[PDB]
């Protein structure tokens, strides 16, 4: 957890959100239910598919062969033959398996970013209209219907409208 | 008060990958770069068929052994196959000159 | 009568994956053989319900 969100202050992956990789769960008067985020998800699927396509499709393989038979009296060359194969099977094995872990931890310290990336947009959208619970959620200081909720997820959340009601309940607390 | 949350994926997967720091890191979905299987049967490499020798080897094939009257057949091939222990070769003992050096020559025609 | 881009002493290799571990003896445009027994890389998240 580099960015500190994945297995960080958000300790649980939501088994219920299957539309995407990132989303929100809202709880208000009208009800509850998960909802996944496409701006964050799709930027990640497309980039990762390409990151997979990257390492796959840069191994250019020429039409060649390996199997060579040597007479018993060219053993030094028959030994040389193997050295040329083992050296590649040395290299292409080492370099690959080290690249896997890398673009594994590089792929785990990407999703941790976007989760953290998402948080500091919703947190920088209300900014005092909700007090942060710390486990990866918010408690709105005001009644927020599904039309208000949907603006928080989109990105056009209205701060001035629900600001007057925020100070009257934040004063309560 | 109303609560909105931020959260990510989880599923029934039991795959585990290994990373630079920790191993057996269970992931929701993974992909494998390594090809581990074959089909047990030869195919048309390069598009054109290969030369199947069977009981005879490259020697008797070019020497036309009297028991290889079944495979003086093919007029285009991308590679040659033969059994690991060829049974019908140079029926008469003797030294075939530059033998190994010709299996790479007739390798593809 | 299959067609492939690779051929080993055990059988063909169909996918466009960049590595194989069937057999080092290949012929044609082939995923370069590697000693690995497993090369799984992450494409999702950590499974944390």
């Amino acid at each position, epitope marked *: 957890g580099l960015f500190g969100a994945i297995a960080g202050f958000i300790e649980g992956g939501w*088994t*219920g959100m*299957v*539309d*995407g*990789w990132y*989303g*929100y769960h809202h709880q208000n008067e009208q009800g509850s*239910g*998960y*909802a*996944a*985020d*496409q701006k964050s*998800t*799709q930027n990640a*699927i*497309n980039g*990762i598919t390409n990151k997979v396509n990257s390492v796959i499709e840069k191994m250019n393989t020429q039409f060649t062969a390996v199997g060579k038979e040597f007479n018993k009296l060219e053993r030094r060359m028959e030994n040389l033959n193997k050295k040329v194969d083992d050296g590649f099977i040395d290299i292409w094995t080492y370099n690959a398996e080290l690249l896997v872990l890398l673009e594994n931890e590089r792929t785990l310290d990407f999703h941790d970013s976007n989760v953290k990336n998402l948080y500091e947009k919703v947190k920088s959208q209300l900014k005092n209209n909700a007090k942060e619970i710390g486990n990866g959620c918010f408690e709105f200081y005001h009644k927020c219907n599904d039309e208000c909720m*949907e603006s928080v*997820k*989109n990105g056009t959340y209205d701060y001035p409208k629900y600001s007057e009601e925020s100070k009257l309940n934040r004063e309560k607390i | 008060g109303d609560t909105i949350c931020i959260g990510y*994926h989880a*599923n*029934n*997967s039991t795959d585990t990958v290994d990373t630079v720091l920790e191993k057996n890191v269970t992931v*929701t*979905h993974s*992909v494998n770069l390594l090809e581990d299987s074959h089909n047990g049967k030869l195919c048309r490499l390069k598009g054109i068929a290969p030369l199947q020798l069977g009981n005879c080897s490259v020697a008797g094939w070019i020497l036309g052994n009297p028991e290889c009257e079944l495979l003086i057949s093919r007029e285009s091939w991308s590679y040659i196959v033969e059994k690991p222990n060829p049974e019908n070769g140079t029926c008469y003992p003797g030294h075939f000159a530059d033998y190994e050096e010709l299996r790479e020559q007739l390798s593809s025609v | 009568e299959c067609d492939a881009k690779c051929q080993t002493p055990q059988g063909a290799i169909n996918s466009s994956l960049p590595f194989q571990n069937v057999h080092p003896v290949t012929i044609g445009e082939c995923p370069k053989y590697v000693r690995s027994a497993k090369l799984r890389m992450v*494409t*999702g998240l950590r499974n944390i*319900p």
Partner: antibody
Amino acid sequence: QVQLQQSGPRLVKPSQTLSLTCAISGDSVSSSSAVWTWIRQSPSRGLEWLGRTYYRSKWYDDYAVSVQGRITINPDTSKNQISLQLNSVTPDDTAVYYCARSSINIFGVFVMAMDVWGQGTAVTVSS
Amino acid sequence: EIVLTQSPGTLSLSPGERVTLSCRASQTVYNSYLAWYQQKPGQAPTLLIYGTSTRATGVPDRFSGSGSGTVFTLTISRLEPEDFAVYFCQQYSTSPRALTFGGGTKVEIKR
């Protein structure tokens, strides 16, 4: 393989309750790798999603905003079937009704497609 | 709500002619949640394409998807008699939940 068998051609009096049942064969209904989605189809309004159900250690229910408040999609772990409830049927609801599956794996993300279809149900609401 | 619109509505092409079916979206559908279907008259539709250009299992190679943003396109390289059918593209959103269709495109075989 996976086959979806549905109820026969039904007939419901106005303002009554529609009740269609979808049977799944070859796939556990509580499979964490499959989604159950209902979609109706009229010649006028075309294809329209109605609702979806699924099990991830617990069951969930999501229905399109066009039918919110009068629709439910209940599963049955015993008969290996699912159902559909459409209360207070108007002349608008006279159409066909299908049920879905989804093994559309995108690294765990679901496209929300239909890889398994059902033949259909003639649902006529009299007036 | 994302309502799709396909052009043309009804088309009459001879067999083997390259068939192009555009899918215009009222707003941007993301590269992952587009699915296509081929519905024969009377028969229920079947999966033709999902994702955006990912061939469904058991679908031949003449069909091939393409596009991004609010412009998607269905394409049959060689039209076939068994392609006398109406083709629907299908989108799915995640917030709010929306899964709609378009007007459909009937592929008439020109005689």
